[PDB]
């Protein structure tokens, strides 16, 4: 419509913030509908610019701050239905459920003593694993990339050698914003001429408390793993 | 047969196992399906449970039906007259008709085995592994692939002991080095001085033989991977020290034998 | 007439309904309820100047241009309507070829119609109207050979013209019995190129389809559909870029060979031009 | 045929208040209990239509109060074998006018005993039907 509203999400530092362009290229501060607040996850949405005019030929920035540490809603991965309403110069609108709400980001790296670790590794919520196998790179650059992407930790090296092969299994740990600790041992082949690694066939073993997020994390990482057309 | 075919003589079960022998002749076999289907279906009567395994076995089966059964089994096996024991017997038979052979089945089975599980597979494993060796199975790459992976996340240290020992001998006659290494590292990965230890011991037959790339590197590796933890330190040191002590070529010859 | 009876529990009901939105259809019962959703997931097309033709997955026409909320394109080029096996433009800004009675039979009817005015069956007299019998008609690679099914199996259809309706049993070659593909892919997972008989492959290339190959209007589009994902090529396999998204529903568009339009919310966007990217 | 390893009438508390190893070649009161344990614990009042343990026939029964064990070899058909087992419940029941109970068991053993020797004697079943007995006995 003249009124075209375009919007995307910007998550700028904790705060997932809503860029909205409602552009009302309308022929007037056309009447506007209705909007509703809610508890969200460890967030709650929390602002609406008050008016409801769709000012003529006019462009507007409508900001929604979201509250990023509260409102539990357990509708995982978000993907929760959201409403913009048809309630005034509007007969309809958008009701939307979100998608676009993923993990790789959330968790931060976190750390451990290795013996205890091992013991723990085994000990943890075993229940998820996903496989590493396939890419576009060596796990040097590739590993770094993935690491940065998820913002997460590989705890320690043994020099055995991530180079000549290595035939290295890398142990990774991370802790998030709402505090889950997640453990990995992924054991991986690694690039190098007619030696081995341009796939893996390494297994990524994922432990996160619910299997459902945990595996999903293994996936998420799987998405993360490579670089291709989303 | 028919007359018995529902526990008149709950006797009927035993017979199929041998007493009245079956391994069929070709049209003859097709005819057999119905009777086995009754037992297979009924799922009850200790006499029944046993019967199901022998009849099905003797007469043999299509792949497809197995599938239906795998689910059936999924519930059944735990106790359903205490199915597990008949089943272990059944299983022992399974390992035999396919002891790492129809590997696709072996894997399907493997997935399933682990899966349907309980725990009770382990016992079975003792047999299964043995079967695979008996063939001296050759879709190992795959077979092994399943084993390796699953076992990892199918646990039990005890299994590892056995398999280790076997593996210990086998090495580079079956190649696929990077993978195999890849595995091996993992096996060690686990704690236990003890768990760790096996990868080195298996290795001696292996190392000595070397494979599609190994001698140079074989020499490089023991260096690259090294450990403290005292007696664990010692294990690294000692193997080394032992290594230290003989011309590694000689070293290999004496020790290996 | 009683077609058939369908059984799926509930020995106790009192309502049935079909939407007056017609969106969905549903049946109500004591023990409970079911809703089922319809689609001819993915469904056939033709192009004539500044106009789109669709054949419904679900939903009627929507065969170009619009005016208020949603408009299913009702025209003399009835698209999403008929009982389609296959629809292909017979290029002209004035022609289409259409198979109806769809389905599996021995063979169906195709009545091929004129954009100037389609019909129940258009004129066999007219060659922008012709109808005959035949089960399906299908494109195949190296672009002028075609498949026609005019037996309930492999007839090859080959014509220089794409006002085409040609019948060719030679190239009989089963080892794939009548089913679905369109540059040959009875789930070949390849688009495989041929002439009008041969018992020796010219060649197959390993690439894949929506089970349709997208031509830039008529019959030469190296812009490719894939069922989920679609790939952009220039004519034939040259994988220019490869598209993927993950919503198992929508579309993105080419103007001609590889002009990439992507839809982006309440924003509609050019994925790319020259070295450019843009929101029109 | 010198075929009874033992016939035991067992409590279902794994106890045995009767055992006669008609025939035996393994021992220990303990091992007997142990052997007992594996199987009894396992069958736990539950029995089976048939059970084979050891390639050996186990015909065992349960009552409404008591667990009956016979151990024999799967090397001698059910129908007969059971028939003796059947004979055991039934006669005791009729004659006494009452079948086995824990109570019954507790008041007096002897009758069981009396019967038992008569029916079977070692690994050879001298008999398996009541009637003969019934007349024969008159205690």
Swiss-Prot record, chain A:
Quaternary structure, from the entry: Oligomeric complex that consists of at least the alpha, beta, beta', gamma, delta, epsilon and zeta subunits. Interacts with CAPN8. Interacts with SCYL1 and PRKCE. Interacts with COPG1. Interacts with ARF1 (myristoylated); this interaction is required for binding of COPB1 to Golgi membranes. Interacts (via trunk domain) with ARF1 (via switch I region); the interaction is direct. Interacts with KCNK2 (via N-terminus); this interaction increases the channel-mediated whole cell currents and promotes plasma membrane expression of KCNK2. Interacts with STX17. Interacts with TMEM115.
Further facts: Brefeldin A induces dissociation from the Golgi of the beta-COP and presumably the other coatomer subunits.
Biological role: The coatomer is a cytosolic protein complex that binds to dilysine motifs and reversibly associates with Golgi non-clathrin-coated vesicles, which further mediate biosynthetic protein transport from the ER, via the Golgi up to the trans Golgi network. Coatomer complex is required for budding from Golgi membranes, and is essential for the retrograde Golgi-to-ER transport of dilysine-tagged proteins.
Coiled coil: none
Lineage: superkingdom: Eukaryota
Protein name: Coatomer subunit beta
Gene: Copb1
Subcellular location: Cytoplasm; Golgi apparatus membrane; Cytoplasmic vesicle, COPI-coated vesicle membrane; Cell membrane
UniProtKB/Swiss-Prot annotation, chain B:
HEAT repeats: from-to residues: 1-28, 30-63, 64-100
Subcellular location: Cytoplasm, Cytosol; Golgi apparatus membrane; Cytoplasmic vesicle, COPI-coated vesicle membrane
One GO cellular component, as annotated: cytosol
Molecular function GO terms recorded: structural molecule activity
Any one GO BP annotation for this protein: organelle transport along microtubule
Predominant location: cytoplasm
Keyword Transmembrane included in the entry's annotation: no
Keywords: Cytoplasm, Cytoplasmic vesicle, ER-Golgi transport, Golgi apparatus, Membrane, Phosphoprotein, Protein transport, Repeat, Transport
Protein family membership: Belongs to the COPG family.
Assembly: Oligomeric complex that consists of at least the alpha, beta, beta', gamma, delta, epsilon and zeta subunits. Interacts with ZNF289/ARFGAP2 through its C-terminal appendage domain. Interacts with EGFR upon EGF treatment; interaction is essential for regulation of EGF-dependent nuclear transport of EGFR by retrograde trafficking from the Golgi to the ER. The coatomer interacts with KDEL receptors; the interaction is important for retrograde trafficking of KDEL-bearing proteins from the Golgi to the endoplasmic reticulum. Interacts with COPB1. Interacts with TMED10 (via C-terminus).
Annotated protein name in UniProt: Coatomer subunit gamma-1
Lineage: Eukaryota, Metazoa, Chordata, Craniata, Vertebrata
Gene: Copg1
Portion of the full sequence shown: 293 to 549 of 874
Swiss-Prot record, chain C:
Keyword Secreted among record annotations: yes
Superkingdom, taxonomy of origin: Eukaryota
Entry GO CC: axon; COPI vesicle coat; COPI-coated vesicle; cytoplasm; extracellular space; Golgi apparatus; Golgi membrane; growth cone
Location(s) in or outside the cell: Cytoplasm; Golgi apparatus membrane; Cytoplasmic vesicle, COPI-coated vesicle membrane
GO molecular function list: hormone activity; mRNA binding; structural molecule activity
Biological-process GO terms, alphabetical: endoplasmic reticulum to Golgi vesicle-mediated transport; intracellular protein transport; pancreatic juice secretion; protein localization to axon; protein localization to cell leading edge
Predominant location category: cytoplasm
Subunit structure, interactors included: Oligomeric complex that consists of at least the alpha, beta, beta', gamma, delta, epsilon and zeta subunits. Interacts with SCYL1. Interacts with JAGN1. Interacts with TMEM41B. Interacts with SVEP1. Probably interacts with PEX11A.
Protein name per the record: Coatomer subunit alpha
Organism, as annotated: Mus musculus
UniProtKB/Swiss-Prot annotation, chain D:
Domain of life: Eukaryota
Subunit architecture: Oligomeric complex that consists of at least the alpha, beta, beta', gamma, delta, epsilon and zeta subunits.
Coiled-coil boundaries: none
GO CC annotation terms, alphabetical: COPI vesicle coat; Golgi membrane
Keyword Cytoplasm attributed: yes
Organism the protein comes from: Mus musculus
Locations listed in the record: Cytoplasm; Golgi apparatus membrane; Cytoplasmic vesicle, COPI-coated vesicle membrane
Keywords: Acetylation, Cytoplasm, Cytoplasmic vesicle, ER-Golgi transport, Golgi apparatus, Membrane, Protein transport, Transport
Record flagged with keyword Ubl conjugation: no
Residues of the full protein shown: 10 to 148 of 177
UniProt lineage: Eukaryota, Metazoa, Chordata, Craniata, Vertebrata
Functional summary from the UniProt entry: The coatomer is a cytosolic protein complex that binds to dilysine motifs and reversibly associates with Golgi non-clathrin-coated vesicles, which further mediate biosynthetic protein transport from the ER, via the Golgi up to the trans Golgi network. Coatomer complex is required for budding from Golgi membranes, and is essential for the retrograde Golgi-to-ER transport of dilysine-tagged proteins. The zeta subunit may be involved in regulating the coat assembly and, hence, the rate of biosynthetic protein transport due to its association-dissociation properties with the coatomer complex.
GO biological process: intra-Golgi vesicle-mediated transport; intracellular protein transport; retrograde vesicle-mediated transport, Golgi to endoplasmic reticulum
Family: Belongs to the adaptor complexes small subunit family.
